[PDB]
């Protein structure tokens, strides 16, 4: 499918998603069932001055994934930038 | 001449025998059902060893193969190439790279390339050492593939420097190079007359220009020819004036991963059989005595593959797929019956792949090997905080240290000073309660002209009512005053850009220290998803991003024009459905919020679906927020399920039983005046710092202007699909970004629109 057409279609697709998610409800229930479950992402970082999505992704996992995280030998690190930067930059205290 | 090896099919037996011939404990190389039996990348040599050695024989590359001690070998996957599966059919082709006659002997570099399905999958770079003295000035040659340098032409004194260079042949000699990014497919051949001076220099290769649509074209040719060369000036030029595409960043302090005890087996027989390295020096003591060495030397590549197991174990989290590279430099020699104490360090990080540096120690406390290892960890995903979480002096700790923060904040603030005549950095730093934007002077007029174009395009009964923001400001207005009760930073118009910038500056500091894989997923908290999108994809430039978020912040301040103070009779509330009752799920919450909103006649809807049966943020009329607060107070106290009584007792009588409770709640919720506080329920907790009703039904009018702005401010030239696709998860549509009729039809279902319906019907025209 043509590059200039695939650029037009991706441009309109995103533009309409952002124009509507502007005034549309945020389905974050299923958003946490796109990456946490379906894509087995290990390390989650929360970019911001306080943790909000942190306690959200952690309590989604404790509800639905405590038996899905312990049964596939994986450690999910839910991190916030302003609180847990050390783990990000790999700059521990010796 | 390019050499070609016999097409070598991968089997499950040979890989199963190799996991004991190296002693690998990785379970991704064991034969089990469902999951594939991936080849360990150290097995790639078994395919290509036959061809690589075939390049070292030629009668013009001459030396004592007994005195040939392997110098350095690697394995590197090309980008995207999946590592070898169980049953794969892998062909080999190699070429001899450089014949370098070092004073101590002759290093010969060999480049082998393995091909599966017709395409390349991994390249093997090696160097070997014929020791002695090599008057080999005729039989020598250097044929290396020079790194693709770029060069940015920001200015005219520096395009004049490039044009002075005769080697830059242009197809269109008038082509305006200014404000472009050229790249150089440089490959340099060189003959030597001596061990330093070159006999002749050959620099050729096309020259491209990155276009705004990210499709390059060959606009020039490099063609540098001379006699008695001492160095390639072309490559020397691009070394200082141009830049390498990939620059590995390092840590402040390298992570001491470990120092693990690997034991060399008494015998080098089980690996010489499976490797095709029959070389007796490893097994035959009589051969090992002829080589002057202190016994039957362990296979080098065996020491390589034994340390690779350790690199995959304790630096690649025990996964076959994610390890990308593996090199080993042969320093010293070690015998069988040793306990090798291998010193692994994580020293670097580059663009997702962890740079792992090691040296190999024995019990004897001496170094026998060095080498690198690239390991991608695609298992990163980003979540971005939304509004309310802002405070005075936020992201100023990052500002005074990082250049990646500094340059972001500075570029935004310069954009804001020159556009709207104010400092977001002033606001964040000291939170002025009021800010007077002065339109005095020619700066001030051009600022005011920017203010004049901020307009609500709000639909009213199938017709747009373009009502100006801050109506007061007109062509005769001198100076406007932005007003806050406590501190303007708190007002959303500034909260949104400040938060979005701090989150862009933090993420650009991680780009500067390159801790961010290029295939991670992401999603953000209502506003957060603007930061994530600018961050992970570069969807908006910094000046674009701040403008669009400012415009949003203006749209959301005067979405509902308020009283004199600025107290909107709207807001939000974060509801635990479990608090009211555990049996009271998400289906009983959406049913009770829709039944209270139809009866009471006011607005209340579910706008964020945060946590599954623990957090749903519901916005609308503030009386329609405290009457649903009292509805989940009264259902909680009464312990009365609606999902039990609607099916298991009576059909739609519960709907007629829900009027009288909503009629109780809404006749005590209609008493309280308009400046009412949303008082925390037993089921609900009210949101602080958010007076606007974002994502509710109140701003259904102001969707069409926000589209009109995102049409003027998202240009398809910036937008790429590759960088988005598989990662981008919208807030509304919780799905991977897909450019298909599946996603167009699933978005048209949630909220229909004229341009998504026009593309679904005309999808077959845009297919071809």
UniProtKB/Swiss-Prot annotation, chain A:
Q: Which residues form a coiled coil?
A: none
Glycyl lysine isopeptide (Lys-Gly) (interchain with G-Cter in ubiquitin) crosslink location in chain = 37
Q: Which residues carry this modification: Phosphoserine?
A: 50
PTM note says:
4'-phosphopantetheine is transferred from CoA to a specific serine of the Acyl carrier domain by the C-terminal PPT domain. This modification is essential for activity because fatty acids are bound in thioester linkage to the sulfhydryl of the prosthetic group.
Residue ranges crossing the lipid bilayer per the database entry: none
**Lineage: superkingdom:** Eukaryota
Job of this protein: Fatty acid synthetase catalyzes the formation of long-chain fatty acids from acetyl-CoA, malonyl-CoA and NADPH. The alpha subunit contains domains for: acyl carrier protein, 3-oxoacyl-[acyl-carrier-protein] reductase, and 3-oxoacyl-[acyl-carrier-protein] synthase. This subunit coordinates the binding of the six beta subunits to the enzyme complex.
Other known facts:
Present with 17000 molecules/cell in log phase SD medium.
How does this chain assemble? Answer: [Alpha(6)beta(6)] hexamers of two multifunctional subunits (alpha and beta).
What is stated as this protein's family in its record? Belongs to the thiolase-like superfamily. Fungal fatty acid synthetase subunit alpha family.
* Name of the protein: Fatty acid synthase subunit alpha
| Provenance organism | Saccharomyces cerevisiae (strain ATCC 204508 / S288c) (Baker's yeast)
Q: Which gene produces this protein?
A: FAS2
Of the parent protein, the shown chain spans 1 to 94 of 1887
From Swiss-Prot, chain B:
Active site per database record: 526 (for malonyltransferase activity)
For region Malonyl/palmitoyl transferase, the annotated ranges are 345-563
Region listing for Dehydratase, in residue ranges: 1-344
Cross-link Glycyl lysine isopeptide (Lys-Gly) (interchain with G-Cter in ubiquitin) per UniProt, renumbered positions: 82
Instruction: Give residue ranges for domain MaoC-like.
Output: 241-366
Q: According to the lineage, what is the superkingdom?
A: Eukaryota
More details: Present with 91800 molecules/cell in log phase SD medium.
User: Assembly and partners?
Assistant: [Alpha(6)beta(6)] hexamers of two multifunctional subunits (alpha and beta).
What does it do? Fatty acid synthetase catalyzes the formation of long-chain fatty acids from acetyl-CoA, malonyl-CoA and NADPH. The beta subunit contains domains for: [acyl-carrier-protein] acetyltransferase and malonyltransferase, S-acyl fatty acid synthase thioesterase, enoyl-[acyl-carrier-protein] reductase, and 3-hydroxypalmitoyl-[acyl-carrier-protein] dehydratase.
According to its UniProt record, which protein family does this protein belong to?
A: Belongs to the fungal fatty acid synthetase subunit beta family.
Q: What is this protein called?
A: Fatty acid synthase subunit beta
Species, as recorded: Saccharomyces cerevisiae (strain ATCC 204508 / S288c) (Baker's yeast)
Q: What is the taxonomic lineage of the source species?
A: Eukaryota, Fungi, Dikarya, Ascomycota, Saccharomycotina
* Gene that specifies this protein: FAS1
Q: Which residues of the full protein are shown?
A: 1283 to 2050 of 2051
